[PDB]
Design a protein around this motif. Structure first.
Motif, PDB file in Angstrom:
ATOM      1  N   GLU B  80       0.819  -1.208   0.000  1.00  0.00           N
ATOM      2  CA  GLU B  80       0.000   0.000   0.000  1.00  0.00           C
ATOM      3  C   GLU B  80       0.854   1.260   0.000  1.00  0.00           C
ATOM      4  OE1 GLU B  80      -2.230  -0.941   3.412  1.00  0.00           O
ATOM      5  OE2 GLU B  80      -3.561  -2.306   2.341  1.00  0.00           O
ATOM      6  N   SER B  81       2.000   1.234   0.686  1.00  0.00           N
ATOM      7  CA  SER B  81       2.816   2.434   0.830  1.00  0.00           C
ATOM      8  C   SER B  81       3.538   2.834  -0.447  1.00  0.00           C
ATOM      9  CB  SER B  81       3.838   2.254   1.950  1.00  0.00           C
ATOM     10  OG  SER B  81       3.209   1.823   3.141  1.00  0.00           O
ATOM     11  N   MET B  82       3.599   1.966  -1.452  1.00  0.00           N
ATOM     12  CA  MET B  82       4.119   2.341  -2.757  1.00  0.00           C
ATOM     13  C   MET B  82       3.026   2.490  -3.803  1.00  0.00           C
ATOM     14  SD  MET B  82       5.993  -1.245  -3.783  1.00  0.00           S
ATOM     15  CE  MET B  82       5.429  -2.802  -3.111  1.00  0.00           C
ATOM     16  N   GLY B  83       1.768   2.282  -3.435  1.00  0.00           N
ATOM     17  CA  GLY B  83       0.671   2.472  -4.365  1.00  0.00           C
ATOM     18  C   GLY B  83       0.428   1.325  -5.318  1.00  0.00           C
TER      19      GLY B  83
ATOM     20  N   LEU F 259      -7.110   9.442   4.504  1.00  0.00           N
ATOM     21  CA  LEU F 259      -8.197   8.822   5.250  1.00  0.00           C
ATOM     22  C   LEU F 259      -8.501   7.416   4.750  1.00  0.00           C
ATOM     23  CD1 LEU F 259     -10.328  12.030   5.402  1.00  0.00           C
ATOM     24  CD2 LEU F 259      -9.571  10.784   7.424  1.00  0.00           C
ATOM     25  N   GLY F 260      -8.508   7.221   3.436  1.00  0.00           N
ATOM     26  CA  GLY F 260      -8.769   5.917   2.861  1.00  0.00           C
ATOM     27  C   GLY F 260      -9.753   5.979   1.715  1.00  0.00           C
ATOM     28  N   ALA F 271      -4.696  -1.790   6.266  1.00  0.00           N
ATOM     29  CA  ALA F 271      -3.820  -1.435   7.374  1.00  0.00           C
ATOM     30  C   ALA F 271      -3.382   0.023   7.350  1.00  0.00           C
ATOM     31  CB  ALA F 271      -2.593  -2.345   7.380  1.00  0.00           C
ATOM     32  N   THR F 272      -3.368   0.672   6.187  1.00  0.00           N
ATOM     33  CA  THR F 272      -2.922   2.056   6.088  1.00  0.00           C
ATOM     34  C   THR F 272      -4.072   3.054   6.046  1.00  0.00           C
ATOM     35  OG1 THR F 272      -2.695   1.734   3.695  1.00  0.00           O
ATOM     36  CG2 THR F 272      -0.698   1.552   5.032  1.00  0.00           C
ATOM     37  N   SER F 273      -5.310   2.594   6.176  1.00  0.00           N
ATOM     38  CA  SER F 273      -6.478   3.468   6.137  1.00  0.00           C
ATOM     39  C   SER F 273      -6.812   3.918   7.554  1.00  0.00           C
ATOM     40  CB  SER F 273      -7.660   2.746   5.501  1.00  0.00           C
ATOM     41  OG  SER F 273      -8.828   3.539   5.553  1.00  0.00           O
ATOM     42  N   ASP F 336       2.738   9.653   6.751  1.00  0.00           N
ATOM     43  CA  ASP F 336       1.417   9.363   6.205  1.00  0.00           C
ATOM     44  C   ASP F 336       1.058  10.263   5.026  1.00  0.00           C
ATOM     45  OD1 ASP F 336       0.777   7.237   7.916  1.00  0.00           O
ATOM     46  OD2 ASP F 336       0.121   8.614   9.491  1.00  0.00           O
ATOM     47  N   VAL F 337       1.621  11.470   4.957  1.00  0.00           N
ATOM     48  CA  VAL F 337       1.373  12.330   3.804  1.00  0.00           C
ATOM     49  C   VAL F 337       2.126  11.810   2.585  1.00  0.00           C
ATOM     50  CG1 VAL F 337       1.704  14.675   2.903  1.00  0.00           C
ATOM     51  CG2 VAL F 337       0.810  14.335   5.183  1.00  0.00           C
TER      52      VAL F 337
END
Lengths: 51, 446, 106, 49, 57, 418
Positions: B80-83, F259-260, F271-273, F336-337
């Motif tokens: 997720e962190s690389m899209g 936010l997601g 997990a990142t939302s 997170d940005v």
């Protein structure tokens, strides 16, 4: 008249004229025993069909 | 401005290599900032017996729940962190996992894929959590009438073979699959001569080959603990399943004859023929003027909601037929008109129909290969099926040699005096008797 | 299409209009047409005010023939007042049938 | 579930050339569908009475 | 600058001549489906959803 | 190579073409029309216009359009938003000249015959009932009616009282006033630039300028509740944000991905939302949550969308709204940005891969801005968004006037003032 004109009308009638002796010769064999056609029972020597 | 013939020559070609494991590596490079890379496996429910029929579908659920190096949710945070996106599926013959990412993230993407298929954890607490997710997903599948009726068609056409089983398996197997049965499934079927690493987009083939040599070379590339499956074929049986339920508002009916396998050259004129029958849906704007006879009749009389024709292929056999949805007073008329179109192609098929059906098949082959994800799936599944990728110029020369007498010959071989397989889901009281369906396969006047 | 018989052949047309007698029953020429499939599609395409006029004129003429009577001579339909209300709708229905027939043979 | 539905066994009804569930029935089908079939054809030469 | 589909959420319908009608972009947004019992009901005017739009050829 | 050729005509028309060497071609005509341009007397005219592309024109009958496109294997589709309509044609490379002629007859010289329009009225009822089998569709049409008083509150589908009563004179009047050359753009994908231009000089005899100005949209802070028999509760809660093509619109796009905005991994736990994690702390039952973003030419909406069960719906909405309040008071990391800028960058480049997504992207840029920008320029505008602007966009939502729409069993759903 352009009533039944077209190259489509005699295309299905091209592939049916092999099985359109099922129209005329089937009438010719459909009148062998329904009629007792006398002089075309000697079409073959095989039919001595009546005594 | 080039022609259609010149544009098929300038399509980039596919480069294939092999490791000492036997793992194949294939690519198509085309100038783009994104890419799709994945792993295609010869595994599926036709390699399972009655004891472990839900084994390959259970393993696909646990594939993204954490490996030995990246435990738990640490795999999800990295993607997720690389899209990037991460997907999977499972049929009766194949299994795939793949990643859509940016083309400069390819070394990280290949490393995650090698860690998924080799070192998945399959821990005991995650297995017990996954049973209830699968048991709830089976109850949701019962509300989809199209998925139920195609499961019925496989179960009656291939009755006592492995090809009649479902992908998900019965509910009693789901309740009892242990951790031992999943580890035996992976070490038997996830082997390097049965895997393909494919990639499409902004990739170089030399870069993917060296990434495959440092992440995949520790695969067991021999036939140790010999499990090379003696491939038994599967026979077709003319038969019928009827499920009567009057409380459902519409009825689903599927019917098929036995079709050819993957590498049979009869496959190309058999889908020129199915493109003449076509498909219809009542949200279409073209109704009562459409070229297909069955589509124009069903729009004028409002006979159905939809129909479609299919061509399902396996390694040695297949299913060739149609599926439709209608109300309870329309089943007999829709079966009458559909069977009359099959008999009108066994005889009587004209040249101008075949020209339209060839143009439909050329457009459907080009329209599928649009984007990195369908190009990558075509690479990974053609190397498991034909052993090679068939280019677009070769598909066009096979299509160009189809004419009206070829279509009449191949349709008479597969349709005419053959017993079909039928499946139906209620309200189906007006579905005709099997003797009246079987006698609709031979014609009266020809 | 002869310019010398421009008025003479219109005298035979006006004579034949009076020898035929649908104008004595208060009918127009397009009321009397035989309704095959192309004519029945053109009636369905008429606007609602021309449809209702045609239905009443036919009913009044059927009622006169039941009684073996005709209308007064001041209520007969004139020759240069007969409106061919159906002819534009019928020429379009036939052109569409002939388009679907050249397509089926080519 | 609908995946609990399978066809029951039909082995004591099949013709003797399709009991094997592994052979793909290529030539054991056209050389099979003829048992009750001149039965139907030599019937209609007897209807010539 | 851009579309309404790039900044995703406002929806769009389509009509075809030989294909099915589609609604929206992110209307069937998921991980409502991995949480249990999201059933698509049986319909009275029912449609084909894959709708030939991703066919192999 | 041959990136794009962009050209303004003297009557206002935009022409753009990229020469591929692909076996297929694609032509699209993009028009400033759709449901925001109709008033209270002709509601539903643009839905019927969308369904009428196969009808008889002056150059081709309805039989020849269906048969002539199917004879070569081509397609014809129409797509609509509240602000635009798009007519698309696709076939193989050698057939593109005769399908370009069919596309110009549909949009520049239609006939709306009485008996054909009357037979099409029942298709409005079929098309609307198919679309409304998704509960998201009617919730989002109620949300635009709750948020605006006019000109974006109009629905994409015809109202029920109006089915049967859309007239041919209304269809002629709509095309005459909204299908004009200064509101249109023609985009090609496998055709050369000289071929599209002499195509374009065959619709300029009429439609010479701008047709009718639409009313500016006025924000209403309303609320619409729809009790029915569905098993789950769908709810949405928004506020007014920013128009498309501004520096504040980029800050709301980054805030959506903080936010997601949908899942990345199949059957993953998101997990990142930050929205999904805050709801799932107190709720132990099936749900879904997302950030909503809709941007238009003079206004925009931003908010949250929840799907939940009936007894748990108040707990889901309150915990989702509290997470946005923490960002607005300064709780925001630069890690997170940066992770949110990666999802926004990768999603834009993936949405332009296919021919379908690339043609829609050029068409929206031609109507809204009248130019084309490379994706390298778009990727640098996302990089320039600072952490202070993401916090300031979450403060505009928290202090702004709300709108709400809900559906299902609403016995535990809170009111918008509570």
């Amino acid at each position: 008249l352009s009533r039944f004109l077209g190259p489509r009308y005699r295309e299905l009638a091209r592939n049916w004229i092999p099985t359109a002796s099922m129209w005329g010769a089937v009438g010719a064999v459909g009148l062998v025993w329904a009629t007792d056609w006398r002089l075309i029972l000697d079409w073959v020597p095989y039919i001595n069909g009546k005594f | 401005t080039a022609t259609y013939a010149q544009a098929l020559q300038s399509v980039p070609e596919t480069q294939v290599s092999q490791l000492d494991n036997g793992l194949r590596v294939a690519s198509e490079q085309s100038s783009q900032p994104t890419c799709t890379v994945g792993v295609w496996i010869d595994a599926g429910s036709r390699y399972e017996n009655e004891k472990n029929n839900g084994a390959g579908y259970f393993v696909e659920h646990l594939a993204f729940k954490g490996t030995k190096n990246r435990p738990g949710s640490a795999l999800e945070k990295e993607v997720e962190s690389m899209g990037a996106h991460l997907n999977a599926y499972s049929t009766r013959e194949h299994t795939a996992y793949y990643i859509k990412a940016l083309s400069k993230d390819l070394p990280k993407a290949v490393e995650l894929l090698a860690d998924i298929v080799q070192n998945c954890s399959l821990e005991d607490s995650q297995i017990e959590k996954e049973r209830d997710v699968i048991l709830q997903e089976l109850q949701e599948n019962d509300s989809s009438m199209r998925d139920v009726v195609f499961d019925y068609l496989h179960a009656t056409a291939f009755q006592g073979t492995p090809l009649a089983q479902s992908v998900e398996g019965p509910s009693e197997n789901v309740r009892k699959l242990s951790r031992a049965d999943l580890t035996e499934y992976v070490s038997q079927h996830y082997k390097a001569p049965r895997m393909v690493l494919a990639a499409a987009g902004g990739v170089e083939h030399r870069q993917l080959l060296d990434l495959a040599q440092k992440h995949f070379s520790s695969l067991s590339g021999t036939y140790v603990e010999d499990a090379v499956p003696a491939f038994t074929p599967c026979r077709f049986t003319g038969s019928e399943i009827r499920h009567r339920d009057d409380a459902l508002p519409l009825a689903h009916v599927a019917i098929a004859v036995e079709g050819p396998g993957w590498a049979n050259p009869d496959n190309v004129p058999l889908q020129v023929a199915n493109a003449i029958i076509g498909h219809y849906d009542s949200t279409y704007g073209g109704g009562t003027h459409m070229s297909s006879t069955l589509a124009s009749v069903a729009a004028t009389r409002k006979l159905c909601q939809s129909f479609q024709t299919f061509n399902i292929c396996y390694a040695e056999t297949g299913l060739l037929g149609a599926h439709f949805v209608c109300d309870n007073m329309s089943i007999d008329d829709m079966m009458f008109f559909l069977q009359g179109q099959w008999m009108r192609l066994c005889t009587s098929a004209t040249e101008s129909e075949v020209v339209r059906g060839k143009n439909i098949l050329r457009n459907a082959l080009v329209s599928h290969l649009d984007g990195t994800t369908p190009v990558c799936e075509d690479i990974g599944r053609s190397l498991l099926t034909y052993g090679r990728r068939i280019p677009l110029a070769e598909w066009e020369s096979r299509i160009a040699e189809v004419d009206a007498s070829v279509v009449r010959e191949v349709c008479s071989k597969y349709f005419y005096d053959q017993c079909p397989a039928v499946a139906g889901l209620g309200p189906i009281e007006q579905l005709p008797d099997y003797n009246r369906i079987r006698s609709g396969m031979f014609w009266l006047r020809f | 299409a002869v310019a010398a018989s421009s008025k003479w052949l219109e005298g035979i047309r006006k004579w034949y209009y009076n020898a035929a007698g649908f104008n004595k029953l208060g009918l127009m020429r397009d009321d009397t047409i035989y309704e095959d499939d192309d004519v029945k599609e053109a009636i369905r395409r008429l606007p609602e005010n021309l449809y209702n006029d045609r239905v009443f004129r036919i009913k009044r003429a059927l009622d006169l023939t039941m009684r073996q009577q005709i209308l007064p001579k001041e209520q007969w339909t004139k020759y240069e007042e007969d409106k061919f209300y159906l002819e534009p709708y019928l020429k379009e229905v036939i052109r569409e049938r002939k388009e679907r027939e050249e397509w089926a043979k080519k | 579930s609908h995946t609990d539905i399978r066809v029951p066994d039909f082995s004591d009804y099949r013709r003797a050339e399709v009991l094997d569930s592994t052979k793909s029935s290529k030539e054991s089908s056209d050389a099979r569908k003829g048992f009750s079939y001149l039965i139907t054809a030599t019937t209609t030469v007897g209807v010539a009475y | 600058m851009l579309s309404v589909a790039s900044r995703s959420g406002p929806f769009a319908p389509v009509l075809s001549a030989t294909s099915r009608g589609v609604a929206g972009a992110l209307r069937p947004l998921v991980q409502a489906a991995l949480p249990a019992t999201s059933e698509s009901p049986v319909l009275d005017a029912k449609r084909s959803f894959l709708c030939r739009e991703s066919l192999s050829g | 190579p041959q990136d794009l050729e962009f050209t303004r005509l003297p009557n206002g028309l935009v022409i753009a073409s990229l020469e591929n060497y692909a076996p297929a071609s694609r032509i699209g005509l993009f028009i400033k029309a759709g449901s925001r341009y109709e008033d209270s007397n002709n509601l539903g005219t643009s839905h019927l216009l969308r369904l009428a592309s196969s009808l008889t024109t002056k150059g081709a009958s309805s039989f020849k359009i269906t048969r002539g496109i199917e004879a070569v294997g081509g397609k014809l589709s129409v797509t609509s938003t509240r602000e635009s309509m798009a007519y698309t044609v696709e076939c193989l490379r050698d057939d593109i000249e005769i399908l370009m002629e069919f596309l110009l007859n549909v949009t520049a010289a239609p006939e709306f015959r009485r008996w054909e329009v009357a037979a099409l009225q029942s298709q409005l009822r079929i098309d609307k009932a198919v679309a409304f089998q998704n509960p998201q569709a009617q919730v989002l049409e109620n949300l635009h009616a709750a948020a605006y008083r006019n000109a974006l509150a109009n629905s994409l589908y015809c109202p029920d009282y109006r089915i049967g009563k859309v007239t041919p004179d209304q269809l002629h009047y709509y095309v005459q006033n909204h299908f004009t050359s200064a509101r249109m753009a023609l985009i090609g994908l496998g055709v050369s630039h000289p071929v599209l231009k002499q195509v374009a000089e065959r619709f300029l005899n009429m439609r010479g300028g701008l047709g009718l100005s639409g009313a500016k949209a006025k924000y209403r802070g309303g609320e619409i509740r729809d009790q029915n028999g569905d098993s789950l509760v769908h709810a949405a809660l928004v506020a007014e944000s920013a128009a498309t093509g501004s520096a504040e619109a980029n800050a709301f796009s980054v805030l959506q991905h903080v936010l997601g905005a949908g899942p990345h991994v199949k059957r993953g736990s998101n997990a990142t939302s930050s929205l999904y994690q805050a709801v799932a702390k107190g709720v132990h039952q099936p749900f879904d949550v997302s950030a909503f973003n809709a941007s238009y030419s003079d206004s925009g909406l931003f908010g949250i969308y929840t799907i939940s069960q009936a007894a748990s719906a108040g707990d889901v909405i309150k915990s989702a709204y509290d997470q946005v309040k923490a960002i607005a008071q300064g709780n925001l990391s630069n890690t997170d940005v940066q992770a949110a800028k990666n999802k926004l960058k990768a999603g834009y480049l993936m949405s332009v891969e296919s021919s379908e997504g690339f043609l829609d992207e050029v068409g929206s840029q031609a109507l809204v801005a009248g130019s084309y920008m490379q994706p390298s320029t778009v990727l640098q505008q996302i990089d320039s968004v600072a952490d202070a602007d993401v916090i300031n966009a979450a403060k505009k939502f928290v202090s702004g006037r709300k709108s709400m729409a809900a559906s299902g069993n609403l016995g535990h759903t809170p009111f918008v003032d509570e």
